[PDB]
Design a protein around this ligand. Structure first.
Ligand SMILES: *P(=O)(O)OCC(C)(C)[C@@H](O)C(=O)NCCC(=O)NCCSC(=O)CCCCCCCCCCC
Ligand SMILES: *P(=O)(O)OCC(C)(C)[C@@H](O)C(=O)NCCC(=O)NCCSC(=O)CCCCCCCCCCC
Ligand SMILES: O=C(O)CN(CCN(CC(=O)O)CC(=O)O)CC(=O)O
Ligand SMILES: O=C(O)CN(CCN(CC(=O)O)CC(=O)O)CC(=O)O
Ligand SMILES: *Cc1c(COP(=O)(O)O)cnc(C)c1O
Ligand SMILES: *Cc1c(COP(=O)(O)O)cnc(C)c1O
Lengths: 75, 395, 84, 126, 395, 126, 84, 75
């Protein structure tokens, strides 16, 4: 229950076992997401962490680590 | 494009914002069927229905048990006229009404004549008002119902409802009044007026379309044969799902009207006098249809000689008005209007939201365009050359 | 205890200011006129209970005005000919 | 009246007026009846070659009656008396896009043309 | 206080937000009477009415001229049944319907019997479905109308509407179907089904209460004697002011349903299977009323032996449901249900907005409280002690 | 069932159960019929002085039937057999605020009391 | 020319974010699910005209959602039992 | 049409000839206003000059000059 509840959200959203949600993985190229999935995934991170992620930041969150990094840097 | 002024409240009214506000919860979360007896969506819907029933009853001096909800005064008029006629038909076959009633009363009576009932269509005086002594004389031993409307929808004339009730009660004849144009605008009390049935329309009193009510007196009991068959809703008198948001809107409109009636009557009286006086002082040959001494001021029907009414409505391109109008006119004919003048009449409606500026704009355009259409009219040309139109052999 | 005079004058300003936001001419002009006429009609009521009833009705009507102004803005239409 | 075509004959009036009924070159048609809500007066002025060189009208009636008779008054100008005889109620209705409930208006306007032309023709025989 | 889940969509539905959105302009600035012919409030109101008429027509495969607006399917059923019966009464006095029809059909037929018409109330099979060959045999030379509802409001069963149309058309008998529970939920096409009249209710399809329609076929022409007298609105078939905001809401609900029908049917099918299967695998002596092979999945009527239905509804204190319910049940009796089991049935409704979580909550509480009421029930006690209830001498 | 008073007898059940029908000190009343939607079983236990010291019930029926029979079962406890005979359908309806359409429920519960008391009385005669 | 993909993904986010503001459980849960299912159902449409029609319908429905969310907040009620 | 259109507004609102709307006059004591009038008068000045006058400022505008002064000091 560290701020890699981020991993739990990504795995839940993309239908992927927690074992395959590696820090290096990009949602599309590595975890099978399309761009509808990635819209929903960004909103799921917004909800889970009570944070508003605007478009120019959302477009940079394309990997597990980028998600982890963004959330650690916004309390 | 800019919108025309609404001067046509006898045809229908806008919702009062207080009425839409009261309705909206029932269009959003309180959507239960008021006949659903086993859960809270039903309970809260039923409770709103019964509160609205009390609001309607309070406005007319009735017991809420005497209020039956309908889809409009058209349905209420059918229920009152056919329902009473059919109930008592084993002993009573004669009905009385008047020649200026709304079309749903007249056509209900015509359908009963095809059913073997006798119907007297009383004439009216040139004032538009019935002759009480002619009503008294028309009552027969098998007369079951008299129906006479409280305020006329075309010309605004007020019938002597309380005096009609005295006549009917004293002879044990049921008395129905179509009060669609009167409810919430002039005082109505079913006991002081000795009314046995009454029709009410929501959308003539700033409530929503698609709803109405019928008052049916319970003491002495008035009996009515139901017209709409079904599961017995509304005490077996009007089967069907009672539409909670609409009856909420009807009750709210009645409560608002009970509060606003005196204020509106004062304000509309002043605007009505202003409209009539300012038109008549500026145009010759303008006549009011209906006696101004027995008249609801928000409904003003005037004839403009030598101009045809529909062309005047066209000319008044930015004012919404009506002519020959069921909310060549059979009402104007019944009060003895010359046929040509009846083709020259239009109806102006002043309501709760009408402004002095609207009245003044309407007056000014009416003066301008009557003059213009007269200058285009061969009848005005002939009269200006001193010709007696009553001497020409037409066609 | 609340001040009836303070409530009343604050409600008067609030109800007039909000009614002036009605998009529709006939509701706006009616609401402003009706509020002015009603407060003036009731100016000389002295019974503290009856004053409180009037104040409570005005608070209810202020909620109605606020909601119906917003709904009328969501579903607005063109102005009338005479607003030109 | 809801058609642009009909209203135009009232908002932008043309040829409203009168000609001299005593002229041998003027024909006057007066048709309809006040009790029926529609009275049309149509007058034509004919030159000495039989060409209609001018016309005026006045109408008591609904917008479609005003437009039908106004259009008829425009349409007779420049036509010979015999040509004007071939103007039909159906051409007027078509031009104005009259709905079926207003077709009696175009028929009265055709009647007005023929009454005017007949009044003129009666004056030429002597 | 927290509100109960709504599982009662056969009694009425919430507005779809798209429907309320389409209605609101007509409750605020477009308040004209659609019969006002001389100004733009009337024109725009008329135009909205006619667009809604086309939306209703498109959903059922009709010509908009065949769509008449009413106040509800109750009124539409009265118009279809009494209107056809009275029109053809000089040559035809016999009508056919079924024992499981809604109360307004049955009571309309009963009123006609008091008028001297003969009515056959066909039985249904224990499936709830009529026997087509028994319908064929019941038709007489003076049979004017057959009326059979498309989807039953209590048990959800689908009648073979197209096969009934084949029978009626081939014998030149008019075919009416009360489609109130079917419109927008299963495919309806008046020509493929050979339907002559159809009843439609707005508030069963996420439209507002107080509105409905009746389809009346124009080719070959079906004739109906009008019931509501008046000025001839709706082609003389339904006089009265057409309530523009409500018919706008009905047309919008029809257009939305035309778009959503396939999606809703898939989703409601899955939820319905889940509800039925999860209740039945967890409780003994649960029976579904009606054949699941000919059944609209959003209406699920189950009996829970040894528990009385109203007590179960009370126990399910946070779920809005219904029992014995006209949208001891005469429908359950007609399909041959034992009287005690008929006292043990309740109706679950799944609609467009129902969630899986609601279904699962409802299932879990139903299992819990059936068990509890059985543990309070003397009938369950007796069966658990091996007593044959059919051997006791009651009272 | 919409009354708090009625629902309470289901949400907070009391005395639901059975007594030993073979006891000379137990009376069993079983009234109503499954086909009528309401069956009440009410049993009483009487001590050797004629005081009812316990009672149980089971009911198949609507909430008002459950509450009427549940209340009857509470009310007989502590009463002599002769006192219990004076419990009336009208007292049960009054306590539960039953509407007129549910008054048949309080009458059946009174029937259940009397059937139980009569069954007990028949066992004492020998 | 406008980018269909950009419009579509911006509309998807906007429609989901606004639908999540529905006060009423049954409208909120329906709107979110329906939007997800509809965009996914239509993912493989290739006709640029048909895509534009779908986009225009989604813009219309976004206006409906925005107005009905606000109206549902003005006239809100208690939560359902299962939201606890 | 100087910023003593303020005088025109006061005279119009209070039914008082322009001659009697003197700079020194208080609305209540000198021009016959009650407190309903003065609410309406403050709103009329707000409308006429496209200015928002909050309560603590409105309570100080009790004379013609105070009205004139306030408006000159807010563009
Ligand atoms: P990504 O994986 O890079 O790209 C995803 C998209 C969809 C953009 C990509 O697959 C693509 O471009 N496909 C082309 C086809 C297309 O654009 N499909 C989308 C059209 S828009 C659409 O389908 C909207 C449907 C709207 C439904 C709303 C329901 C609302 C209900 C509310 C009720 C109150
Ligand atoms: P000022 O001259 O110092 O004081 C003025 C007052 C009124 C405060 C003073 O005279 C006083 O205190 N009078 C005591 C009586 C009193 O308080 N009367 C006011 C009661 S509140 C009232 O009357 C509100 C009426 C509300 C009408 C709203 C109509 C709304 C319509 C909307 C439709 C959409
Ligand atoms: O307070 C009022 O009576 C109404 N209006 C003025 C009404 N206007 C119409 C308009 O503002 O467009 C009057 C008019 O132009 O006729 C106040 C406001 O503007 O907020
Ligand atoms: O997106 C959805 O499906 C609905 N909700 C969650 C629905 N909740 C109810 C609630 O939020 O109170 C589910 C629940 O509690 O059952 C999202 C949101 O909160 O904005
Ligand atoms: C409007 C009216 C009616 C019909 O009322 P609806 O509610 O439109 O059915 C009946 N009588 C009169 C006098 C009316 O003005
Ligand atoms: C609801 C319903 C009706 C009545 O419809 P209303 O619009 O409420 O008058 C008629 N038949 C069936 C099958 C229904 O479910």
């Amino acid at each position: 229950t560290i701020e890699e509840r981020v991993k739990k959200i990504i795995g839940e959203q993309l239908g992927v076992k927690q074992e395959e949600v590696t820090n290096n993985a990009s949602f599309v190229e590595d975890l099978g997401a399309d761009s509808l999935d990635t819209v929903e995934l960004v909103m799921a991170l917004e909800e889970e962490f009570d944070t508003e992620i605007p478009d120019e930041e959302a477009e940079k969150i394309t990997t597990v680590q980028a998600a982890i990094d963004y959330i650690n840097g916004h309390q | 494009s800019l919108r025309p002024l609404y001067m046509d409240v006898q045809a229908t009214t806008p919702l009062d914002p207080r009425v839409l506000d009261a309705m909206l919860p029932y269009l959003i979360n309180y959507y239960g069927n008021p006949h659903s007896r086993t859960h809270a969506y039903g309970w809260e819907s039923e409770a709103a229905m019964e509160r609205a029933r009390q609001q309607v009853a309070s406005l007319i001096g009735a017991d809420p048990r005497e209020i039956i909800f309908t889809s409009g005064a058209t349905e209420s008029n059918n229920i009152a006229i056919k329902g009473v006629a059919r109930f008592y038909r084993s002993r009573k076959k004669h009905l009385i009404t008047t020649q200026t009633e709304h079309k749903c009363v007249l056509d209900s009576c015509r359908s009963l004549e095809a059913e073997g009932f006798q119907v007297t269509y009383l004439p009216v005086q040139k004032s538009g008002i019935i002759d009480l002594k002619e009503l008294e004389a028309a009552i027969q031993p098998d007369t079951s119902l008299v129906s006479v409307m409280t305020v006329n929808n075309e010309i605004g004339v007020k019938q002597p409802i309380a005096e009609i009730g005295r006549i009917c009660s004293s002879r044990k004849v049921y008395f129905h009044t179509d009060a669609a144009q009167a409810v919430g605008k002039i005082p109505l009390d079913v006991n002081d007026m000795k009314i046995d049935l009454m029709s009410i329309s929501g959308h003539k009193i700033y409530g929503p379309k698609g709803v109405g009510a019928i008052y049916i007196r319970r003491r002495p009991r008035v009996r009515v044969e139901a017209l709409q068959s079904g599961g017995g809703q509304e005490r077996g008198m009007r089967s069907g799902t009672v539409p909670t948001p609409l009856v909420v809107g009807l009750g709210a409109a009645c409560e608002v009207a009970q509060q606003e009636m005196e204020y509106d009557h004062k304000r509309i009286s002043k605007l009505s006098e202003r409209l009539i006086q300012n038109i008549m002082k500026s145009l010759p040959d303008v006549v009011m249809n209906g006696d101004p001494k027995h008249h609801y001021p928000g409904c003003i029907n005037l004839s403009f000689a030598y101009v045809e009414g529909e062309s005047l409505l066209m000319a008044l391109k930015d004012v919404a008005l009506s002519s020959g109008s069921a909310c060549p006119s059979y009402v104007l004919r019944a009060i003895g209007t010359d046929e040509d003048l009846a083709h020259s009449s239009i109806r102006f409606g002043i309501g709760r939201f009408t402004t002095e500026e609207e009245v003044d704009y309407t007056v000014e355009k009416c003066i301008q365009h009557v003059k213009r259409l007269r200058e285009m009219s061969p009848l005005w040309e002939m009269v200006q050359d001193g010709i007696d139109l009553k001497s020409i052999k037409w066609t | 205890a609340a001040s009836s005079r303070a409530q009343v004058l604050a409600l008067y300003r609030a109800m007039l200011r909000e009614s002036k936001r009605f998009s529709a001419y006939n509701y706006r002009t009616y609401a402003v006129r009706r509020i002015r006429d009603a407060f003036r009609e009731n100016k000389n009521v002295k019974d503290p209970v009856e004053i409180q009833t009037l104040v409570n009705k005005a608070k209810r009507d202020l909620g109605v005005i606020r909601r119906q102004v917003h709904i009328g803005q969501l579903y607005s239409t063109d102005k009338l000919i005479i607003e030109n | 009246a809801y058609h642009k075509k009909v209203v135009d004959h009232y908002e932008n009036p043309r040829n409203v007026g009168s000609l001299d009924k005593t002229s041998k070159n003027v024909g006057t048609g007066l048709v309809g009846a006040p009790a029926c809500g529609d009275v049309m007066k149509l007058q034509i002025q004919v030159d000495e070659k039989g060409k209609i060189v001018d016309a005026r009208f006045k109408t008591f009636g609904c917008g479609s009656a005003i437009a039908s008779s106004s259009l008829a008054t425009e349409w007779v100008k420049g036509k010979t008396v015999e040509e004007a005889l071939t103007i039909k109620n159906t051409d007027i209705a078509k031009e104005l896009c009259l709905p079926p409930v207003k077709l009696h208006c175009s028929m009265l306007a055709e009647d007005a043309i023929k009454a005017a032309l007949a009044d003129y023709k009666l004056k030429q025989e002597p």
